[PDB]
């Protein structure tokens, strides 16, 4: 549990809510829409951000948000618009938890060191390395904790109980399951978790409509992470901002209130 995420998580407890938290990589389809993008999920609902730095091969997604790092990519955003932003949308959203998803090689490409400082500076609450597994992160949750940021870690779908365990330990503002609940198991694995004082878990896999959001928070998590779904808007109206924003500002309205 860590600074901003535990507030968070206390107000939506004494709200009887759960948390909505979409993801978007900076920067697609161009810095300043991008910013705009993330300015409408704050005003429309989102209980905190999980964002990405462009990376031109992502192992671990898919064709979609592929598709947004190559976005963001060819729109040419820089790792220092990536940080402008992020530090923009602070001033604007002090106590609005921000969440970074990334890819090992960008971090070490910027230096370990230079890359969290310049997220410290930024104000980023967690960072989360996409492609390295629990037992391999030291060097990464060490540079977490020296500046300030909460090392988050994924409990995979095939999960055993000693890596869990450390997935719990380890481990700080929330947990990310790479699950889902079904709409009307999942159930065992949160209540290994809570056992574990696991901070809270948030199930981020294929959520894409308001149900599962619901179904989400009825099986214990604490909320819905929803990745590819919001991207998925994004691409359709990369070219037409006002539908973009609309559309985009209906989701998360739509995807918020079921919690």
Same mark, same amino acid.
């Given at each position: 549990?860590?600074?901003? #995420?535990?507030?968070?998580? =206390? /107000?939506?407890?004494?709200?009887?809510?759960? %948390?909505? !938290? +979409?993801?978007?990589?900076?920067?697609?389809?161009?810095?300043?829409?991008?910013?705009?993008?993330?300015?409408?999920?704050?005003?429309?609902?989102?209980?905190?951000?999980?964002?990405?730095?462009?990376?031109?091969?992502?192992?671990?997604?898919?064709?979609?948000?592929?598709?947004?790092?190559?976005?963001?990519?060819?729109?040419?955003?820089?790792?220092?618009?990536?940080?402008?932003?992020?530090?923009?949308?602070?001033?604007?959203?002090?106590?609005?938890?921000?969440?970074?998803?990334?890819?090992?090689?960008?971090?070490?490409?910027?230096?370990?060191?230079?890359? #969290?400082?310049?997220?410290? =500076? /930024?104000?980023?609450?967690?960072?989360?390395? %996409?492609? !390295? +597994?629990?037992?391999?992160?030291?060097?990464?949750?060490?540079?977490?904790?020296?500046?300030?940021?909460?090392?988050?870690?994924?409990?995979?779908?095939?999960?055993?109980?000693?890596?869990?365990?450390?997935?719990?330990?380890?481990?700080?503002?929330?947990?990310?399951?790479?699950?889902?609940?079904?709409?009307?198991?999942?159930?065992?694995?949160?209540?290994?978790?809570?056992?574990?004082?696991?901070?809270?878990?948030?199930?981020?896999?294929?959520?894409?409509?308001?149900?599962?959001?619901?179904?989400?928070?009825?099986?214990?998590?604490?909320?819905?992470?929803?990745?590819?779904?919001?991207?998925?808007?994004?691409?359709?109206?990369?070219?037409?901002?006002?539908?973009?924003?609309?559309?985009?500002?209906?989701?998360?309205?739509?995807?918020?209130?079921?919690?």
């Amino acid at each position: 549990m860590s600074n901003r #995420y535990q507030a968070k998580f =206390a /107000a939506l407890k004494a709200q009887d809510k759960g %948390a909505f !938290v +979409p993801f978007v990589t900076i920067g697609d389809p161009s810095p300043e829409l991008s910013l705009k993008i993330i300015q409408t999920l704050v005003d429309n609902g989102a209980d905190a951000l999980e964002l990405g730095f462009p990376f031109s091969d992502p192992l671990a997604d898919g064709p979609v948000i592929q598709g947004a790092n190559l976005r963001s990519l060819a729109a040419g955003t820089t790792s220092s618009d990536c940080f402008d932003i992020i530090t923009k949308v602070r001033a604007q959203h002090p106590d609005m938890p921000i969440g970074l998803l990334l890819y090992a090689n960008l971090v070490f490409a910027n230096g370990i060191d230079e890359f #969290y400082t310049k997220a410290q =500076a /930024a104000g980023v609450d967690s960072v989360l390395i %996409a492609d !390295v +597994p629990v037992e391999e992160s030291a060097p990464f949750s060490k540079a977490a904790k020296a500046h300030g940021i909460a090392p988050i870690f994924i409990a995979p779908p095939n999960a055993d109980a000693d890596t869990l365990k450390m997935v719990s330990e380890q481990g700080e503002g929330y947990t990310y399951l790479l699950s889902r609940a079904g709409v009307t198991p999942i159930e065992n694995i949160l209540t290994q978790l809570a056992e574990f004082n696991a901070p809270p878990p948030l199930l981020g896999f294929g959520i894409a409509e308001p149900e599962q959001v619901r179904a989400a928070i009825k099986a214990g998590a604490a909320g819905a992470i929803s990745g590819s779904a919001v991207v998925k808007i994004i691409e359709a109206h990369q070219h037409d901002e006002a539908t973009l924003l609309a559309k985009l500002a209906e989701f998360t309205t739509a995807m918020k209130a079921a919690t």
